[PDB]
Amino acid sequence: GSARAAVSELMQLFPRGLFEDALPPIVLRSQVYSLVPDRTVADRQLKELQEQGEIRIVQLGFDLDAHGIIFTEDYRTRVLKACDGRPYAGAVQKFLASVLPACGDLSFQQDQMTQTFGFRDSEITHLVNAGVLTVRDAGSWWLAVPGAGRFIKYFVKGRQAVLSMVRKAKYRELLLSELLGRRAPVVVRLGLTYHVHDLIGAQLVDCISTTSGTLLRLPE
């Protein structure tokens, strides 16, 4: 179990064509813990591999522990094709050439951004224009991924959906082989395989192994 390997698999699962090649392929830290049993180390590998500049971990808002992952190169290649042709395309390019390869912190302070990156107080709206700078608070702001709205809406919808059917299942159990074999519900479009990894990481289910494969149960 390697975090380099772990993140790669999730990346493959992503429905790339579903979002018209605009949102870079997000993979969650929750589903990272699914492939690698020892979470204790998964964070440690991704930590140095964060400052290694080959990954971007973006903080999301669907829960307190919402930390998404965006591929660095793909994060780069997609912002220009989204920013260019727009009024905000000006200093977002600077943000890219200066801020991204010099820092890896999840949220930038006011004095940090203005001084270290030499940002004015007028162009800062342009980064807020299309998913570049979120709003942590008055003094700090988390790093944004453009066009993240649609993803989480489907993501949250999907999580609820899978949770619901699992509960509905007779005797409140549902075999994992019975998810893949059965057609994915139309309510969730991110992929049934994508979400089942999420609850495993979120510990909403436990991977109980038996003679008939592995089973998931709500916590007792």
Partner DNA sequence: CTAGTTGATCTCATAAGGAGAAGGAGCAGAGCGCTTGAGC
Interaction site with DNA (CB under 7 A): 165, 168-170, 174, 185-187
CB nearer another protein, residue 48 or residue 170: 48
CB 118, min distance to another protein, A: 16
Nearer to another protein by Cβ, of 47 and 94: the residue is 47
CB of 178 to another protein, least distance (A): 26
Torsion angle of alpha carbons 126, 129, 132, 136, nearest 10°?
A: 100
Which residues touch 217 (CB under 8 Å, ≥6 apart)?
172, 173, 205, 206, 208
| Pair of tokens at residue 106 | 């999840």
Could you tell me what percentage of the chain is helix, strand and coil, using 3-state DSSP and rounding each to the nearest 5? 50, 15, 35
CB of 186 to DNA, least distance (A): 4
Residues within the interface to another protein (CB under 8 A): 33, 39-40, 42-44, 47, 61, 64-65, 103, 105-107, 109, 112, 128, 131, 134-135, 137-140, 149, 203
Closer to DNA by Cβ: residue 89 or 169: 169
The C-alpha atoms of residue 200 and residue 181 are separated, in whole angstroms, by 19
- Compute the half-sphere exposure of residue 27: CA atoms within 13 Å on the CB side of its CA: 27
Starting at the edge strand found earlier in the chain, the sheet holding 214-217 runs 174-175, 214-217, 206-209
| 39 vs 172, beta carbon nearer another protein | 39
Contact criterion met (CB below 8 Å) for 74 and 58: no
- 40 interface partner picked from another protein, DNA, none, CB below 5 to 8 A per type: another protein
Q: Which does 135 bind (CB under 5 to 8 A by kind): DNA, another protein, none?
A: another protein
- Least distance to DNA from the beta carbon of 107, Å? 32
Rg (CA), the chain: 19
Question: Shortest gap between Cβ of 61 and another protein (angstroms)?
Answer: 6
Closer of 99 and 188 to DNA (Cβ): 188
